[PDB]
Amino acid sequence: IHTFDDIPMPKLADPLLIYTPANEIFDIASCSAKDIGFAIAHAQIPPGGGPMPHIHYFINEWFWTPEGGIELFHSTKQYPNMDELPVVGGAGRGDLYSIQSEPKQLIYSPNHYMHGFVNPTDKTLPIVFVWMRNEVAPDFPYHDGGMREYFQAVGPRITDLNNLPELTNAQRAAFASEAPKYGINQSSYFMEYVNTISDKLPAQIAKLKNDKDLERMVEVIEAFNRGDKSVTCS
Amino acid sequence: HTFDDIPMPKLADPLLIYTPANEIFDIASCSAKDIGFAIAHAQIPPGGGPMPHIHYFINEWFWTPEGGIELFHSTKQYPNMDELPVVGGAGRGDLYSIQSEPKQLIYSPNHYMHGFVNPTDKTLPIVFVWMRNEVAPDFPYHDGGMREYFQAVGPRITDLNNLPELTNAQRAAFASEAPKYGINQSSYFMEYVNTISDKLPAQIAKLKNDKDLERMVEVIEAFNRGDKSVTCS
Ligand SMILES: [Cu+2]
Ligand SMILES: [Cu+2]
């Protein structure tokens, strides 16, 4: 099992706290430096929370599970063309494999893979996501490859820490329907993109990693948190 | 395994309900001296259909006039309503998928975990029959509970072209109230689920009960002829 010791959060003066339509509590920020741009969210996942299967085109993603418990789903197949949805009528639905995450496990998911996750437990579980701008991403306002812009556009702001905002039908539908604008094909129901869910995890998925880029993004976050003005987080 | 037709009892004022599982239902309950059941002629929009659940009060038939609908079904049975298919209870379960064909009839006895979805981009028809089983308590329509369930949790459709919006309370109740009506209903798709496989076991493929369906069709047909020895409402 590939683990990672810590992924810190850039501490903004005005944190952006969002309750996603996938029932996830996000503290999210965008960072960039000369050589890199990304979004990062420190998240809490209540029981049953997590996104339906989806595929990214503008970012590579890391999942870090401090307490494990999170069940991730991941394809072996890649879907390199955003215009071809992995649906029954078209190119065809995908085979996914489940990962029973362990404490401080680091999962790397390159662009074009299908993935998702759920908290299948009764605990409210921590997870950190890092979404790094890839080499074909268009330039978004925060130069991050589009993911914070997506969550900010689709998820209500948590203005009251002790009362989570109401999620509406429109917000749930938008979570899927706005996603392509941010280089995401996001399914609206669990079985839309999915053919099978198997528990025997192929070693090729299991082996995927990119610590070098994660370590660079950690240097950026840590620098921002020390007041270094050569990087920006906002 | 196919079935030629399952007719709908024609009520003066059909009961049209949009379920919190995004199903458009034309539903009724019927009973006669020996038998009680609910039936719905449904249209399932893209992505519609219930998340995995298990029945305690009924045996269920699914009939897919145009196929298309994808069903999910366990081999394992869960005979104790107080033991959920979750860590700590019975354990999360293995499901097997069924890609339905035209006029296919799928029989699902009580205690099996099942569900379905319309995975296509067009609305599809399905007919449900839920037959009151050996142990079901007595509900007002004597049907084993299913019509009372849907009528309690889901809104009436006042206009098929302008479907009612489901509320958060309705969706919550579809899960939370289900055990009162003899259903353990999951609130997210993978709650009760370990794996989903496309290799359909023969022990599931062979499930059938044409004899009880034929009895229930006879009740419906009799009701539709005006026979007062049976009731549909
Ligand atoms: Cu993702
Ligand atoms: Cu059922």
B124 CA to chain A: closest CA distance, Å? Answer: 14
Could you say which residues from 96 to 115 on chain A have a Cβ atom under 8 Å away from some Cβ of chain B? 98
Report the CATH number at residue A140: 2.60.120.10
- Is A192's CB within 8 Å of B168's CB? no
| Region label for A74, one of left (φ > 0), alpha (ψ between -120 and 50) or beta (otherwise) | beta
Distance of CA A200 to the CA centre of its chain: 23
Cα A55 from Cα B69, distance rounded (Å): 24
A225 CA to chain B: closest CA distance, Å? Answer: 38
Q: Which domain holds residue A144?
A: 1-234
**B196 with A196: CB under 8 angstroms?**
yes
CA dihedral A114, A120, A124, A127 (to 10 degrees): -20
Picking from A87, A166, A197, the nearest residue to B195 by CB comes out as A197
Radius of gyration from C-alpha coordinates of chain A: 17
Two tokens at A87?
């649906």
Cα A100 from Cα B76, distance rounded (Å): 22
- Is B195's CB within 8 Å of A199's CB? yes
Q: A39 pairs with which residues across the strands?
A: A30, A131
Torsion over CA: B64, B67, B68, B71 (sign): positive
Cα A199 from Cα A206, distance rounded (Å): 12
Distance A234 CA to ligand 1 centre (A): 21
Burial class (CB in 10 A: 0-12, 13-18, 19+), B154: buried
Q: What is the resolution of this structure in A?
A: 1.9
B84 part of contact set with chain A, CB < 8 Å: no
In total, the C-beta contacts within 8 angstroms joining chain A to chain B are 52
Cα A26 from Cα B2, distance rounded (Å): 49
Q: How many CB atoms lie within 10 A of CB B161?
A: 5
Tell whether A61 is in a known binding site.
yes
**A107 with A72: CB under 8 angstroms?**
yes
Cα B95 from Cα A108, distance rounded (Å): 28
Cα B44 from Cα B18, distance rounded (Å): 10
CA dihedral A199, A202, A203, A204 (to 10 degrees): -140
- Is A196's CB within 8 Å of B196's CB? yes
- Is A118's CB within 8 Å of B196's CB? no
Tokens 């009162």 belong to B180
Tell whether A54 is in a known binding site.
yes
Cα A143 from Cα A39, distance rounded (Å): 9
**How are beta strands B183-185 and A184-186 bridged, if at all?**
unpaired
Cα A161 from Cα B18, distance rounded (Å): 34
Task: Give the E-state strand segments of chain A in sequence order.
Answer: 16-20, 24-33, 36-45, 54-56, 59-65, 71-78, 94-100, 105-109, 113-118, 125-133, 184-186, 194-198, 232-233
Altogether, the residues listed in chain A come to a count of 234
Tell me if residue B174 falls in helix, strand or coil.
helix
Tokens 């007719």 belong to B7
Measured from the alpha carbon of residue B181, the closest ligand is 2
Task: Give the E-state strand segments of chain B in sequence order.
Answer: 15-18, 24-32, 35-44, 53-55, 58-64, 70-77, 93-99, 104-108, 112-117, 124-132, 183-185, 193-197, 231-232
Contacts of A35 (CB under 8 A, 6+ apart): A216
Tokens 């362990």 belong to A102
Total domain count, chain A: 1
Q: A105 pairs with which residues across the strands?
A: A3, A65
CA distances from B198 to A49, A193, B71 (A): 26, 14, 11
Tell me if residue B204 falls in helix, strand or coil.
helix
| Region label for A72, one of left (φ > 0), alpha (ψ between -120 and 50) or beta (otherwise) | beta
DSSP H helical segments within chain B, as ranges? 146-153, 168-176, 202-205, 210-225
The DSSP symbol for A180 reads G
Picking from B87, B188, B195, the nearest residue to A118 by CB comes out as B188
CA distances from A207 to A58, A198, A215, A223 (A): 22, 17, 18, 30
3-state secondary structure A129-155: EEEEECCCCCCCCCCCCCHHHHHHHHC
